[PDB]
Amino acid sequence: AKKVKIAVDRNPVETSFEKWAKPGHFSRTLSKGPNTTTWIWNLHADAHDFDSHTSDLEEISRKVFSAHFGQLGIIFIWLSGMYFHGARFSNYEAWLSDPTHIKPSAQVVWPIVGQEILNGDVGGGFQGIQITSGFFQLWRASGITSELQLYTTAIGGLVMAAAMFFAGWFHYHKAAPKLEWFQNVESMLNHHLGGLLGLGSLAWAGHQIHVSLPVNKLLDAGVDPKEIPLPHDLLLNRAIMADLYPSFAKGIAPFFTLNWSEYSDFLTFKGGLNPVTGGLWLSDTAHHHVAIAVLFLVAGHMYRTNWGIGHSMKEILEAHRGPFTGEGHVGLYEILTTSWHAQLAINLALFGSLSIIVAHHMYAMPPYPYLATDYGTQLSLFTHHTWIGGFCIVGAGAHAAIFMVRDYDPTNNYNNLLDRVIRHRDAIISHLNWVCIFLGFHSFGLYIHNDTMSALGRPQDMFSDTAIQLQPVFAQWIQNTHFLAPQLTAPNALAATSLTWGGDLVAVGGKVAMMPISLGTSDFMVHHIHAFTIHVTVLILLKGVLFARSSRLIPDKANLGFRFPCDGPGRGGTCQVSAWDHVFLGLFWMYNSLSIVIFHFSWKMQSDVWGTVTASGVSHITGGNFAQSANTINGWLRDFLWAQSSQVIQSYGSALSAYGLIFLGAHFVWAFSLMFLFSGRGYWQELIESIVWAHNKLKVAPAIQPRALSITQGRAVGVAHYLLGGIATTWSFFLARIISVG
């Protein structure tokens, strides 16, 4: 019964610049200094690999804890800059008056070498680069009405950034927690559930109830922003709040007397979108965060720390034991309290999956005012948070394999769930292998079937709505069920959560904010492409984790490590057998799969949702050509890539000309990467020998011997440039397109 308590060590390390002048001090191998250029790359590659510098878990934990303070400090500088640039280099104040006609802008360029053309005409008597980060919509929702309020937040952001860097220094050099402190998982969950998420949600509800709701109620009514009461006047004067919301006339007595229905005027359950602004009701959002606050505060009292009551996480795991799974979850608690990589593997997996869920829910239920009708912001936010989720998931595979090689110990795992999974890995990979082949034929083969039938003049033989049909009947049933939910299954909800299920469109400023989305044959075909490309990415990453330690090819792969190039040309060739190489290959397939996801979103929205409302009806940007054209590969090439890339390639000579340059430059970086992917360092080391000879001939040969990159670094350099070039190409193409037409 080890008590939960604060435990630190005093002055563990000395604050000196001595080691700043000795590169490689952290590692025994690199401490001797460079002899070849390979040393330089090894210095940066192993800088943050704490688990390999020392075998002491306590020393590893202390570095992780302070390295996290540095990450927090950097985010505050970044957040401070965004708020500062809104105050000093933005047209936010003008935007508040005319949100539907003025384009948000918060970056201004200097007039040098003729780059001032990038300062486009955005409105409000202002010239600058149009932003798609959605900060203006967020600030309006919170109630910010002046650049002074933006300026104060930026100054507070810098103070927080300074505090974060002090904390990192303090908790590493002055008072470093001990290992027993880091292993109170029960205590950490209690504080992070009820304290971080719980009180954070309650505190934000306080801001919305007292600041956001009154300010946005008057803004929607048409009051001039400068004439709205200041947030502190709303807080101090209950009389003002009573005018906007009569419930405030009764104070907090209804809360304590359980007459919670008194607060129905500002704690609503409307659902749908606010017709004036096209975003979610803030009164709905306040009741959401109040409900979420109670749920998490209750959640934070589940685990036992010092007073008997509560649950032991070890006891829960050991009780869940069945007939089909041997020992069961035994041994997981020790794994998850002694392996940072195991924790990172789980957290990256769910944190990445969460970022993808955010993308879907924010577009379908636009939570900020004037977010929906700003098509550039909708496209950018969905695409940004899908890419973030994709990279995190691939990392989850990377750090699951690191755990398998380094932190896995067979003695602690005998006949438990983890052990039994390893003992039928061939069954898992063989079945997942077949599923991917099945899904590739029956999804991408349909496109090839349609392309061939169309080229042969046999449209009646294609898979389409006017031909052989493939209707997503299951998805269509769910769309109808959610559309009728307020009638019978959610009686107290006035409207459906989203307008995608069905009903009538909401139009703000003559543009569609959201309308029902219909699923047809093309939607059926594209969705099963997603299932195909996701399943393949699982195959590559799961295969790397399950075969990290051994396989039928390399029986002792664990001893080779996690990151090695091969085991030589024997056995026919063993290139790229290490678990690191399964992340390397998995990155390509993740990029392949998410590219189709963001092409699907971009074409579907422009074709079927986005558009201009007029007397006759809705005219969409691409005029509803998704249904008939997206069932062939030729349709995507012609109607999507070729037609919509018109904006980016005609950008020269305008404020969008920067996107044209990056469109070409991205194409360049991508092709440049194939040099590293298609070649091997054997050629390049011999090339450097001849180059070194010329320098030797001129007495200008370096003391640090030039070396061609290692095998692994060639693959890492290749994939990094491949991803940057490919993703930046879509980024330029999307923004130049949507900003130009959207």
Binding site: T411, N415, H424, D426, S550, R552, D556
Partner: protein, 144 residues
């Protein structure tokens, strides 16, 4: 030292089993058997995946290829300080013994071994490929 004789009835470790074991090759071409003595019951890692408990006293395992047997041998020697030995077994019932070929592990020099494939020259003293051309088959200068 004399060549050990394999005992097919030797007990095997406590192992549930896995899908990484023998295939149809063992029934048609050959398979490999590794045996050793255990001082105490202990958990070790199977080269085919998973964990097994070695019984105290003799233990016996069967593997699909030689590298798997010698991978387990390295684990037993380095960590548990044991002295395993493994054989090659053919479907006809013949048993061939190897590692240690003469009873002493190859890392240690032993009298009586005869050098094989030893060239009394350097790599840089091989003849050019033209001088071993049309020798009836693709032959490297190192072979001659």
């Amino acid at each position: 030292w004399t060549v050990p004789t394999l005992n097919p009835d030797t007990p095997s470790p406590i192992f549930g089993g896995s899908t990484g074991g023998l295939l149809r090759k063992a029934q048609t071409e050959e398979f490999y058997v590794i045996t050793w003595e255990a001082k105490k019951e202990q958990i070790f890692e199977m080269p085919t995946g998973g964990a097994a408990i070695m019984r105290q006293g003799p233990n016996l395992l069967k593997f699909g290829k030689k590298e798997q047997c010698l991978a387990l041998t390295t684990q037993l020697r380095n960590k548990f300080k044991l002295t395993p030995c493994f054989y090659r077994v053919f479907p006809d019932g013949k048993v061939q013994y190897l590692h240690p070929a003469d009873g002493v592990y190859p890392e240690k020099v032993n009298a009586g071994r005869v050098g094989a494939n030893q060239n009394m020259r350097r790599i840089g003293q091989n003849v050019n490929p033209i001088k071993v051309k049309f020798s009836g088959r693709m032959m490297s200068p190192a072979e001659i």
